[PDB]
Amino acid sequence: VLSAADKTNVKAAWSKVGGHAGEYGAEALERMFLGFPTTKTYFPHFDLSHGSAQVKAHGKKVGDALTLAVGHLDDLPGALSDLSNLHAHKLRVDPVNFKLLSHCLLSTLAVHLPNDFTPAVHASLDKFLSSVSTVLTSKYR
């Protein structure tokens, strides 16, 4: 459900993120673990302390996956097909948790790119994120 100009907005917005994707996914995660504690449930084996090298580590995992989807918007089901199986078949994550991480991710970007985070870029990124949230939670097997 991504329009033509949503795509352009996305591709361009993510180029401004550049190489901090990793950094951002790590901070976006930390914000979620403090604001929505119900999520520390899917991470019992992790060290959720503030300077956790495990979170920084996972954050990277997350940021990279996104940059991956940005380069394949015309077929997100084809490029995330494995992450979809992990989060929907194996982990069985509640889809409501996806709206939360997306929200915390958007809160991070506002803090770091206050001048590029224009209302129009906000509308596109929110939709792009929703597409990704839909794919990852669909058991099409």
């Binding site: 403090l34 803090v111 209302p119 906000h122 509308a123």
Partner: protein, 146 residues
């Protein structure tokens, strides 16, 4: 829904530096743009065609300020949220017929905006405080529903 003694002190300490007229005007505009179906409740405001028409609209800057003022009246009376929003509840429920999921939205956008404005001082810990001091207002507003 009290947060804590140390937390709370920091919550009111931020609201002092909050610039009403602008913070609230960008929060409403952000909502009309991102979730375009809420535009339906403000047709009498005029032209909301695109993000440029909406941000520069006077009625939106005006109304946005009042909504922001209303939050402040909550950021202070954290102990009496269900009596401080008693009337508003009645307006948004049986009168306007607004769905409660929207109270949610405006709440988070208000936060995404506070982030863009205060930068690195809006620490993940502070954001956590605001996340409840926002969720409580969202709930008070849905109380006098049934």
């Amino acid at each position: 829904v009290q947060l804590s003694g140390e937390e709370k002190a920091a919550v009111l300490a931020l609201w002092d530096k909050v610039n009403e007229e602008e913070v609230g005007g960008e929060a409403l505009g952000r909502l009309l743009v991102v979730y375009p179906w809420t535009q339906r409740f403000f047709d009498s405001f005029g032209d909301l065609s695109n993000p440029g028409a909406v941000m520069g609209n006077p009625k939106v800057k005006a109304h946005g300020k009042k909504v922001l003022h209303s939050f402040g009246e909550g950021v202070h009376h954290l102990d009496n949220l269900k009596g401080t929003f008693a009337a508003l509840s009645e307006l948004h429920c049986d009168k306007l017929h607004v769905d409660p999921e929207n109270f949610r939205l405006l709440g988070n956008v208000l936060v995404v905006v506070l982030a863009r404005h205060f930068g690195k001082d809006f620490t993940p810990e502070l954001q956590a405080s605001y996340q409840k001091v926002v969720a409580g207002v969202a709930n008070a507003l849905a109380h006098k529903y049934h």
